[PDB]
């Protein structure tokens, strides 16, 4: 019944960063601990000095900046996968699924949710990092060497249009719930039940969009297509991951992420 508020509360409880918090920082109102702007080699070094001094003490600047940024991005994804798992466990019905089916839903779902949610911490000029205390510019990322400069640019492009829909956290929580509870993931066994789980979530999303955005009459099918865009975005991103597996020596993938990427 009241599936939407349980989903919204699960979202509010399990994600350290969200859109309300992110927009405070991106608008420019974070006066106490404002986001350090990382826009070149030198501001990246200052940021690392202040935010991860244990790492600079261990000679981490003796690695290329691309490798350092890669590692930061890696750790954030690992963190978010953990939050997504706890989020999913709180979606009504999820905890009753077969363990292997739960693994399947997360494996194929986490990165669609990550890049959806990544939009919240993005603006036209850059993205928040380090729990809102850093802001790495879009142009600095483009200025890195191949293939690292190729990773974030399509996410910025997705985020710009997604953000033009002006969703709030209540919308995004249901959106991410629909991404995770997807009945067409390869290898699902209880397809019938997961399909009914998604039918309920998509139903409440539709109702919620109608009352939370009464002006945008076509927002629901727009969001449905954004779901398909994200699957395309992830399939394209997986091949960038593949280029790094093969042709980058000092860019070791975290074990949890290679398990996720093993068969996509």
């Amino acid at each position: 019944k009241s599936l939407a508020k349980r989903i919204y509360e699960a979202y509010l409880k399990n994600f350290n960063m969200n859109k309300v918090k992110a927009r405070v920082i991106l608008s420019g109102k974070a006066s106490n601990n404002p986001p350090f702007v990382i826009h070149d080699m030198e501001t990246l070094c200052m940021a690392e000095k202040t935010l991860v001094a244990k790492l600079v003490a261990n000679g981490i600047q003796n690695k290329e900046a691309e490798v350092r940024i890669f590692h930061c991005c890696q750790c954030t994804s690992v963190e978010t996968v953990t939050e997504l798992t706890e989020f999913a466990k709180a979606i009504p019905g999820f905890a009753n699924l077969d363990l292997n089916d739960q693994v399947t839903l997360l494996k194929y779902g986490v990165y669609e949710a990550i890049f959806a949610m990544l939009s919240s911490v993005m603006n036209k000029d850059g993205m928040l990092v380090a729990y809102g205390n850093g802001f790495i510019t879009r142009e600095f990322l483009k200025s890195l060497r191949k293939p690292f400069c190729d990773i974030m640019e399509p996410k910025f492009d997705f985020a710009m249009k997604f953000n033009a829909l002006e969703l709030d956290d209540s919308d995004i929580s249901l959106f991410v719930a629909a991404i995770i509870c997807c009945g067409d993931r390869p290898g699902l066994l209880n397809v019938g039940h997961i399909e009914k789980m998604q039918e309920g979530i998509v139903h409440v999303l539709r109702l919620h969009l109608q009352s939370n955005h009464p002006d945008d009459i076509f927002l629901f099918p727009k969001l449905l297509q954004k779901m398909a865009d994200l699957r395309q975005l992830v399939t394209e991103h997986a091949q960038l991951v593949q280029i790094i597996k093969k042709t980058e020596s000092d860019a070791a993938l975290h074990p949890l992420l290679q398990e996720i990427y093993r068969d996509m």
Partner: peptide, 11 residues
């Protein structure tokens, strides 16, 4: 076991 299973079986 696999790392995703562990996250799902955690307390």
């Amino acid at each position: 076991p696999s790392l995703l299973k562990k996250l799902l079986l955690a307390p």
